[PDB]
């Protein structure tokens, strides 16, 4: 995890870094091997948390493409 971009509950929870369902996070995508049209290597993108880590003990997210 690189950063917490937007916790939909509140910007206060965003700045506290709360990871709940629907939170937008920044993830390191280096091992996926993505290249832009200009030849740059992508190593950071956004994802949305899709579960409740307080209930299942882990963070699940879907990449935003």
């Amino acid at each position: 995890i690189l950063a917490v971009k937007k916790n939909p509950q509140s910007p206060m929870y965003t700045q506290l870094g709360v990871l709940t369902k629907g939170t937008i996070i920044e993830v390191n995508v280096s091992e996926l091997g993505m290249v832009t049209a200009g030849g740059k290597v992508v190593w950071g993108k956004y994802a949305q948390v899709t579960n409740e880590p307080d209930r299942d003990g882990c963070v699940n997210a879907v990449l935003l493409v």
Partner: protein
């Protein structure tokens, strides 16, 4: 195969940022006077020596190479090798003074006193709950102007007892909006005068 190494009693100093070379050696006016036939050759030879030394320094500079192909942003392609010029040494006057800082406004001083941190400005879209749409909160097709196009408005009971009872509530809201905007402009003008 003439040499490329130039001998000088006083070393030439260089400003490789501006591509300039300065030599402060003894110049004899007998060979540079207008009465001499070799003045042009003399000037050309000394300029040639100074330019040769300058070129030697420029080719001794470190070089930047890239691997990106043509057709992208940047202007340097893989086959090209550029020189890295140092910052210019010679100090020259600017054409205008530096931008002085804007003085702190009344609002900014009030925020500093009362501990108001500046807002995030995430975006200009808001969710209108009575519909299912994300609409701009201001501007062109902004949500601040929906009352003007609202089909039906209930007249507030406080408007009774006044002469403003008969006027359109949409017109009253537009007048209030313009009054607020002009007040904001007046406050900006006051901060400008201060």
């Amino acid at each position: 195969n003439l040499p490329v190494t130039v001998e000088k009693p006083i070393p030439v100093v260089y400003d490789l940022g501006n591509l300039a070379a300065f030599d402060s050696n003894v110049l004899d006016k007998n060979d540079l006077d207008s009465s001499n036939a070799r003045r042009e050759e003399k000037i050309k030879s000394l300029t040639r020596d100074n330019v040769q030394l300058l070129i030697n320094q420029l080719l001794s500079l470190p070089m930047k190479t890239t691997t990106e192909s043509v057709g992208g942003t940047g202007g340097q392609s893989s086959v090209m090798t550029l020189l890295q010029l140092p910052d210019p040494t010679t100090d020259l006057p600017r054409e205008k003074p530096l931008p002085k800082a804007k003085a702190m406004t009344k609002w900014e001083k009030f925020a500093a006193k009362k501990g108001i941190k500046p807002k995030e400005r995430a975006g200009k879209m808001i969710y209108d709950e009575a519909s299912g749409e994300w609409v701009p909160k201001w501007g062109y097709k902004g949500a601040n102007k929906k009352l003007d196009d609202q089909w039906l408005v209930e007249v507030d009971d406080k408007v009774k007892g006044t002469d403003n009872e008969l006027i359109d509530p949409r017109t009253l809201n537009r007048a209030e909006r313009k009054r607020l905007v002009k007040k904001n402009e007046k406050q900006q003008r006051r901060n400008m005068k201060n």
